[PDB]
Paper text:
To address this question structures of MccB bound to either one or four molecules of hexanoyl-CoA were solved to 2.75 and 2.85 Å, respectively. These co-crystal structures were obtained via incubation of MccB with 5 or 10 mM hexanoyl-CoA before crystallization. Interestingly, the electron density corresponding to residues 452–477 of monomer F was only present in the crystal form bound to four molecules of hexanoyl-CoA, suggesting that the helix-loop-helix lid region of MccB is stabilized at higher substrate concentrations. The first region is located at the entrance of the substrate binding pocket, which is characterized by a network of hydrogen bonds between the adenosine moiety of hexanoyl-CoA and the protein. The adenosine moiety is further stabilized by a hydrogen bond from the backbone carbonyl group of Pro453 to the 2' hydroxyl group of ribose. The structures of MccB with hexanoyl-CoA bound were compared with the previously-reported structure of PccB bound to propionyl-CoA 21. In the PccB co-crystal structure, propionyl-CoA binds close to the entrance of the active site, leaving the 3' phosphate of CoA more exposed to the solvent. In contrast, MccB sequesters its substrate deep into the active site via hydrophobic interactions between the side chains of the residues lining the substrate binding pocket and the aliphatic portion of hexanoyl-CoA. Further, the adenine ring of hexanoyl-CoA is tilted ∼90° with respect to that of the adenine-ring of propionyl-CoA in the PccB co-crystal structure. Superimposition of the substrate bound MccB and PccB structures strongly suggested that replacing Gly161 with Phe in MccB would cause a steric clash with the aliphatic chain of hexanoyl-CoA.
X-ray crystal structures of [name] alone and in complex with hexanoyl-CoA reveal the molecular basis for medium chain acyl-CoA recognition by this unusual YCC β-subunit, prompting us to rename it medium chain acyl-CoA carboxylase beta subunit (MccB). Similar to other bacterial YCC β-subunits, MccB has 3–2 symmetry and is composed of three individual dimers that form a ring-like hexamer. Taken together, these results establish the existence of a unique YCC-dependent pathway for unusual polyketide extender unit biosynthesis.
Author numbering:
A (entry chain A): 15 to 75, 81 to 448, 480 to 532
B (entry chain D): 354 to 455, 475 to 532
C (entry chain C): 16 to 75, 81 to 174
The structure:
């Protein structure tokens, strides 16, 4: 009636939407060892920066506020991001039309202003009660993932059981982060698998964090708890630009202008004996600021390393063969892990820094029949299509096709330096060929350097290439092998 | 999915219209497909359809469930014309998997027809199958001057 | 041995950069001329020179660098690309390896949008390489033309 009544009424609806509903959802998600949708948003975002949208949205035809999702925008370490968070306690987190509307709106906003989207998933997918309509909205969301791909960074946190579209949309985003014990990913759950196929599998066997972090490749990182996952996402965003036009952040740095002990150690990192290995991370850490890097896909395809670090305060992407696993050869899994990484970085103007120690490809019927030709060539395509600055350091083995793919000069690297332990040849074993000097004679490598000068040369190459521009093919898109 | 995905992206690159004949139970679940990455690799087909801008006509002959319906040239993923035969079944799930979430089953034949989807305008036409060719031919003729904008980017980041 | 391989790199570095500079100064000072490297050091800010293709050699005496010193550095804090003919080594003559080295730094300068200074001191075309020497002159010319009005060229 009165103005004061209407304002007190608004306070009452807000206590029911944010306090009562939250306590009810905390009680029911306590049954599963999980935080609530709102708790997760408050852990992710800068305190006090959250601006919630569509707080009082309801389904048409119990009609709780929000229809099972919390949307809005905020900031993470001072930069704006958009967020949605599923409420599993409402109808299993399934998306109805009101639900989907809130998510569609928040994605449209993020596309409109060009900021990242963090999706926090905890959902059975599409709401069966609404038939075609729920499928329609999840398709709208997926279309917005596709049109966002390479335009704004997209990050998915999987923080519960997830099926159907609730795993389909994360697969279209750039990074999928799972949490130990509480999260899963499958097309459909185990009881539907039993009734339909019918296999008797446990949820962890079917789509647990370890399955997706180590086997399928669908998870880029698994956190020990929810806060570990959320903290990983925050660190990740600290490396990336808001969009594909505006620049990545630049932090100040304590890099040394001369040669340090850590630089000199690289002169002794390669063993004398060819059948002895080394840890490529011992090389990576000596180059990157503070020896630190956030590793993508750490438990998947450990024979290659993909990480973000910084050189002189600038975001840098590192792809490096890891000799401590499978001799650092390329297989299908390493190829696709590094391929998608490079394409993401090229889409967002992060230069790629490659450390090459590649004896060749993993042989075998398993590799060849599972499509090593069309799946491993994705890494070739990724490198050749990219236009970001590309610097390559060749530490040791560099044979045949492996040499070609790992950012050689001919595939489009802007700067290729070799250590004296680098062996660039068609195949191995006569070791007058066991060195980089035939390649250096042809100019295929630009520099043969003492290993201890690596950090100095990389830092100066990156700086020399900050204004690089390269023309692209005139086309709707390419036809990369799938 | 990988077969049809690269097929579609190729046809879109060379401006060949895509005509989809749809009767799909959904994506194949089970440990074999999950551990091989069905989640991100089957979605390549979604990326292919949504990415494309060529004219797209879809004929739904029979089954149209879940992700299968979404991916196989649905209206929301960007199809310009969606026509369904009367034998079309458009639902989130089949009645055998949706109802163990309550024989209150053949009342789930609410969904055993195309008329709910037609009611929401998610399909444009419900036609006798014998008129398909007729309706495809004119739809293709009507769409030859289609133009659609594309995102401003070096390239997307399709799942690999 | 790793330490051996690094020691060997140090040795070749000194035959390519140090000893050749001594021989080249001895023969060009006779003619009242500086060397390719000394001119680069006069041009560029101290300590900013990054040399490329130091160990390039022709294919068929096969001296390192094939008669041209190429790289990039700074002039008054701003980036430039540079090449400098070594007239003592093989007459500073235009070969395929030579021309490759100059094409590389011209491509680099066009890539990053910085000026190019080229220091010329050359007996012409390596005749033994036949039409190839022409082919590489033409290649450089074409890059001059596509750079024209795009990057400064001195
Ligand atoms: C990016 C591309 C987008 C493409 C879009 C698409 O194609 S979408 C694909 C279309 N299909 C899907 O998304 C469906 C996938 N989902 C499923 O198969 C199933 O829902 C499931 C595997 C999660 C099974 O979950 P369970 O119900 O067994 O688990 P649980 O018992 O803990 O769930 C508790 C509560 O949540 C309800 N519930 C769970 N999932 C539900 C759903 N999808 N729709 C409606 N209600 C659901 C249950 O009824 C139950 O309600 P009560 O507690 O009240 O009894």
């Amino acid at each position: 009636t009165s103005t004061a009544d209407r304002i007190a009424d608004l306070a009452a609806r807000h206590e029911e939407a944010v306090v009562l509903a939250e306590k009810k959802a905390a009680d029911r998600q306590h049954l599963k060892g999980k935080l609530t949708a709102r708790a997760r948003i408050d852990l992710l975002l800068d305190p006090g920066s959250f601006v919630e949208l569509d707080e009082f949205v309801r389904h048409r035809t119990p009609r709780p506020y929000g229809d099972g999702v919390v949307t809005g925008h905020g900031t993470i370490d001072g930069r704006q991001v958009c967020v949605f968070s599923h409420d599993f306690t409402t109808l299993g987190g399934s998306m109805g039309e009101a639900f989907g509307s809130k998510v569609v709106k928040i994605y449209d906003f993020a596309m409109s202003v060009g900021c990242p989207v963090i999706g926090i998933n905890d959902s059975g997918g599409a709401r069966i009660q609404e038939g075609v309509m729920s499928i329609a909205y999840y398709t709208e969301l997926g279309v917005r993932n596709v049109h966002s791909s390479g335009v704004i960074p997209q990050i998915s946190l999987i923080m519960g059981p997830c099926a159907g579209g609730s795993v389909y949309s994360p697969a279209l985003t750039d990074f999928t982060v799972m949490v130990k014990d509480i999260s899963y990913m499958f097309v459909t759950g185990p009881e539907v698998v039993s009734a339909v196929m019918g296999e008797q599998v446990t949820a962890e066997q079917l789509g647990g964090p370890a399955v997706h972090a180590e086997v399928s490749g669908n998870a880029h990182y698994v956190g020990d708890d929810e806060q570990d996952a959320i903290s990983w996402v925050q660190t990740l965003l600290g490396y990336l630009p808001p969009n594909n036009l505006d620049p990545a952040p630049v932090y100040d740095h304590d890099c040394a202008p001369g040669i340090t002990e850590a630089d000199l150690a690289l002169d002794t990192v390669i063993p004398d004996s060819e059948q002895q290995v080394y840890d490529m991370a011992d090389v990576i850490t000596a180059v990157l600021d503070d020896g630190d890097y956030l590793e993508i896909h750490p438990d998947f395809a450990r024979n290659i390393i993909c990480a973000l670090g910084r050189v002189e305060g600038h975001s840098v992407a590192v792809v490096a063969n890891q000799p401590r696993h499978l001799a650092g050869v390329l297989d299908i899994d390493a190829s696709e892990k590094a391929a998608r990484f490079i394409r993401f970085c090229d889409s967002f103007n992060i230069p790629v820094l490659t450390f090459m120690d590649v004896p060749g490809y993993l042989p075998g019927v398993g590799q060849e029949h599972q499509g090593i030709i069309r799946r491993g060539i994705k890494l070739f395509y990724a490198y050749a299509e990219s236009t970001v600055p590309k610097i390559t350091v060749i530490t040791r083995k560099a044979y045949g096709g492996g040499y070609a793919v790992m950012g050689s000069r001919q595939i489009g690297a802007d700067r290729v330096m070799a250590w004296p332990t680098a062996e660039i040849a068609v195949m191995g074993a006569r070791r007058r060929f066991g060195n980089p000097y035939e390649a250096a004679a042809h100019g295929y490598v630009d520099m043969v350097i003492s290993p201890s000068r690596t950090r100095y040369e990389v830092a100066r190459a990156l700086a020399s290439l900050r204004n690089k521009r390269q023309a692209r093919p005139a086309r709707k898109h390419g036809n990369i092998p799938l | 999915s990988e077969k049809a995905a690269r097929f579609i992206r190729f046809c879109d690159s060379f401006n060949i219209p895509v005509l989809t004949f749809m009767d799909v139970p959904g994506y194949l679940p089970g440990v074999g497909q999950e551990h091989q990455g069905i989640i991100r690799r089957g979605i390549k087909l979604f990326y292919a359809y949504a990415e494309s801008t060529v004219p797209k006509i879809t004929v739904i002959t029979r089954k149209a469930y879940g992700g299968g319906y979404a991916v196989m040239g649905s209206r929301q993923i960007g199809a310009d014309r969606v026509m369904a035969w009367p034998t079309a079944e458009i639902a989130v799930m089949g009645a055998n998997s949706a109802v163990p979430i309550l024989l209150v089953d053949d009342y789930r034949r609410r969904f055993g027809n195309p008329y709910e989807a037609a009611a929401h305008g998610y399909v444009d036409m419900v036609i006798s199958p014998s008129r398909t060719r007729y309706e495809v031919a004119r739809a293709l003729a009507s769409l030859r001057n289609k133009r659609q904008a594309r995102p401003a980017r070096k390239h997307g980041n399709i799942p690999l």
